[model samples]
Target: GSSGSSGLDHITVVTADGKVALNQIGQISMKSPQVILVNMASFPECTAAAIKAIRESGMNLNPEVEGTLIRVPIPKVTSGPSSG
Candidate 1:
């Protein structure tokens, strides 16, 4: 399930195992070692907006292949300041 937006790029789901995950919409990262995805198009107006959202949410976005879809590798975070 997705919260807030369903832009395919901005939506995400956290697995029961504690791994942050994203949909394989573009078949991107299908063969890569990454485990997450970020919707670049959703935040096309501002790259920083997307990054800020992730950072504030305590998530990480890693682009393995650049194009319509981006691959984001999730990193474990302890605690950080909130941004909202």
Candidate 2:
């Protein structure tokens, strides 16, 4: 997940296309090493939209909601078979 920060850092949570990053909605932290947790206590309303943006981020992230918290798993990919 080391290389996943870029995508997560750029997740846009907006209203009517207003640019707002995910961190602006809540607190983001790593639960273990492969999981990301977001606390939306500041603005619970942004939880839904935040989840939507994460899911639609095209990073293959599937965020699950727990009240005001959003949890997402970091996806790990390995190099595909290459021609020698």
Candidate 3:
């Protein structure tokens, strides 16, 4: 299984058959600096699961759900913060 996400979570997408789907978890866009937003519109559950994964991954993040939003701020050293 491969992860399309450029995140530390490595959040993967799965199909109904329980097999890894070669699909992206979601899309991402930037609203501004010190903030990151990931849109998992097609799969709220996906982001939901990723929350725990990322939390335990030792990556500084904030898993707050504002609708289908997945906003993660840049931690340590990053170049302009990568978008989803």
Candidate 4:
């Protein structure tokens, strides 16, 4: 569940060592709302922890982890209208 152009700021990891945020450790090119490519080869452990944190913290973003790159598709998020 996420955004494409609107997902520019979906997350931010403010830590001590750095190289955790997407832009810091890797790059996020949202080719389409459903297609997101990330490169994390430079920092191996950067996203593992973030991935765990994101999962444990409650976002089941089952990413496709391949060595140092993580690619995941952001499905269209839909929900019923909120009740007053």
Instruction: Please report the candidate that would top lDDT against the real structure.
Output: 2
Per-model clash counts, in order, read 2, 0, 1, 0
Model 2: residues >4 Å from true position, as ranges?
1-6, 79-84
Query: Which candidate, 3 or 4, would have the higher TM-score against the true structure?
Result: 4
> Per-residue CA lDDT of candidate 4, range 1-84, in tens?
235452323554444465344555656666555766666666566756545433544455665666776666565555346567
Score residue 6 of candidate 1 by CA lDDT. Answer: 29
Q: Which stretches of candidate 3 lie over 4 Å from their true place?
A: 1-23, 75-84
Over the stretch 28-76, how does candidate 1's per-residue lDDT look in tens digits? 2333343444444643333333334445554444434344445556445
- The TM-score of predicted model 3 comes to 0.54
In candidate 2, list every pair of residues with a backbone clash. Answer: none
Say which prediction, candidate 2 or candidate 3, comes out ahead on TM-score.
Answer: 2
lDDT of each: 0.40, 0.75, 0.54, 0.54
lDDT of 2: 0.75
| Per-residue lDDT of model 3, residues 1-84, tens digit only | 124434543444443445322134655555556555667787776766545545655555666557777776665566365878
Q: RMSD of candidate 1 to the true fold?
A: 11.1
Position 4, candidate 3: lDDT: 40
Kindly provide the TM-score of model 1 when superposed on the true structure, using C-alpha atoms.
0.33
Error of 2 at 63 (Å): 0.5
Cα deviation of 83 in candidate 1 (Å)? 28
All models, RMSD in angstroms: 11.1, 3.4, 7.8, 4.4
In candidate 4, how many Å is residue 70 off? 0.6
